[PDB]
Paper text:
.To gain further insight into structure-function relationship of such chitinase like lectins in general, GlcNAc binding glycoprotein, a tamarind chitinase like lectin (TCLL) was identified and analyzed by X-ray diffraction and biochemical & biophysical approach. TCLL displays significant sequence and structural similarity with members of GH18 family but the active site residues for chitinase activity along with chitin binding cleft residues were found to be mutated. So, TCLL lacks chitinase activity as well as binding to chitin polymer. Moreover, the structure depicts evolutionary relationship with class III chitinases and bestows the ability of plant to expand the sugar binding domain.
Residue numbers in the entry:
A (entry chain A), B (entry chain A): 7 to 272
The structure:
Amino acid sequence: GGNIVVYWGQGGSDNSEGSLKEACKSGHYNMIVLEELITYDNGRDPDLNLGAHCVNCTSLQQEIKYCQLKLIKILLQIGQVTPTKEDTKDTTKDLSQYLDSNFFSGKSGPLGEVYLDGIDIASVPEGLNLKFDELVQALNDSATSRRIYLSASPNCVYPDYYLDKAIQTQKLDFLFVQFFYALPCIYTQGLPEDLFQAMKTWTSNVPESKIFMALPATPDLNGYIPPRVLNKEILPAVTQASNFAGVMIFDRYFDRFRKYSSKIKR
Amino acid sequence: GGNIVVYWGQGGSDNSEGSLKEACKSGHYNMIVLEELITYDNGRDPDLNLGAHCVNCTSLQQEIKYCQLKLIKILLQIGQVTPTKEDTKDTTKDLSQYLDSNFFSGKSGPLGEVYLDGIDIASVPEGLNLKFDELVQALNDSATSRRIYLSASPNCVYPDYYLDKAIQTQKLDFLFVQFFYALPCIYTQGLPEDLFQAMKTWTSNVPESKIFMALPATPDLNGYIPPRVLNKEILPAVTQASNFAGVMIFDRYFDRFRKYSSKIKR
Ligand SMILES: *[C@@H]1O[C@H](CO)[C@@H](O[C@@H]2O[C@H](CO)[C@@H](O)[C@H](O)[C@H]2NC(C)=O)[C@H](O)[C@H]1NC(C)=O
Ligand SMILES: *[C@@H]1O[C@H](CO)[C@@H](O[C@@H]2O[C@H](CO)[C@@H](O)[C@H](O)[C@H]2NC(C)=O)[C@H](O)[C@H]1NC(C)=O
Ligand code: NA
Ligand code: NA
């Protein structure tokens, strides 16, 4: 089956996109990125935002552990940095410490008593105080024997305006490169040329990281690649890169109904 | 000040984007579109999704009423239709009835004991059973003496693939035409030509509806129009349309920090 990851958490409620446990139980995925943690440039404690799944999300603990028991990695995405004009000391250091204590120590944090597998950073602006590359360095230099995977979700345009500094730390394990919405590098009908060139650029310029092609599971999003095109046309070309890792599915909501991941080649 | 509306509800928590009451109290807006209600193609009761603002959102009642007391209209956006392959009878009729009872009757629904001012529909796919134009007709033919405003948020491409049928009912009071993200009709630096042509097309083809130009409040989104450009370059041209209504701000989160609406001409 190879490596197929998925985003979950912003697809509505358990009714609309399924529980986290349902996603894991499906067997389609070996990694899930939870969307998303809101962080504060002024150092206020982060706010978890799993939409209509939960407000008290501590009961997700058992679902996270169920997933991990099935060898599925669970990463939390930082999706929003609320900016401040105030100059505040130690914001990045303090966020790293907050994350370590609340998600990477088995202690009672917003997702219950878990050890998550890592942190993803969305392609969004950093703060005047909170800096992504500094955060990546801090997390990797965490006082723990646990492995904290670090990743980012840049758009397919290289360099990514928001994430390039974090990428150039050389400390990201995975990149989920987004080939959806309107960008010059997405697949369009009968035209993978720009996608191929972008994949060449990402794989060659970030040889230290595993590169995922993040694709939409619905034809109602720009960048959609029909499964036969993906299997016969795209994967044969992009898999020539030694650091091509697999496909990241945007997102669990669309995949739950479309069963796109089910149609990807073995 | 004219007509300035804003989207609120998907900007995170009260910490990140402010409470609904804060938005109303700011005095920047005369209409707020709440994002967003999830509806079900199989007829399951809708799920409210105000992200990390609340799970039990009934206490928003007092904030909605405070807003309405300041002559601010509050509309709820349908942002997601969860599809089914099942053929289910009366889905659209039953949704209209659910909305009437739960948001337009002063009874105890998901937002407490309110009479909302209307319903907006996002540019998203309808269902195999739930149909937007039929929903608009049903809501307008509601057994009530209350005014239910109906609107949609099409992208700037005309016709809008998802919403054109609803628009052609001629029963939409407002259109919030979205000139952001990557589309051929957005403003780009020194180039309003495509935006002007799109505004001409929308205003001339939908003369029965009030047309809002929905714009991003942050330079970090495609389509951003610097305030001086908006005031001196865009508004003088587009305001020549008799049905040009004003500016819709995407969104309260960005506006709270950028104060974009504050910089729009009187
Ligand atoms: C920071 O990055 C380094 C390099 O990837 C990680 O070091 C690896 O750790 C694993 C398990 O601890 C070892 O099996 C490897 O031998 C290490 N590799 C190297 C090159 O030293 C380290 O674990 C990361 N820090 C965190 C908190 O995950
Ligand atoms: C359906 O649309 C019609 C037309 O816009 C609305 O009828 C108006 O209602 C207001 C207040 O009830 C009256 O002042 C107007 O005279 C009516 N206009 C016309 C042309 O009849 C009607 O209210 C809408 N239905 C709902 C539930 O809002
Ligand atoms: Na879709
Ligand atoms: Na921004």
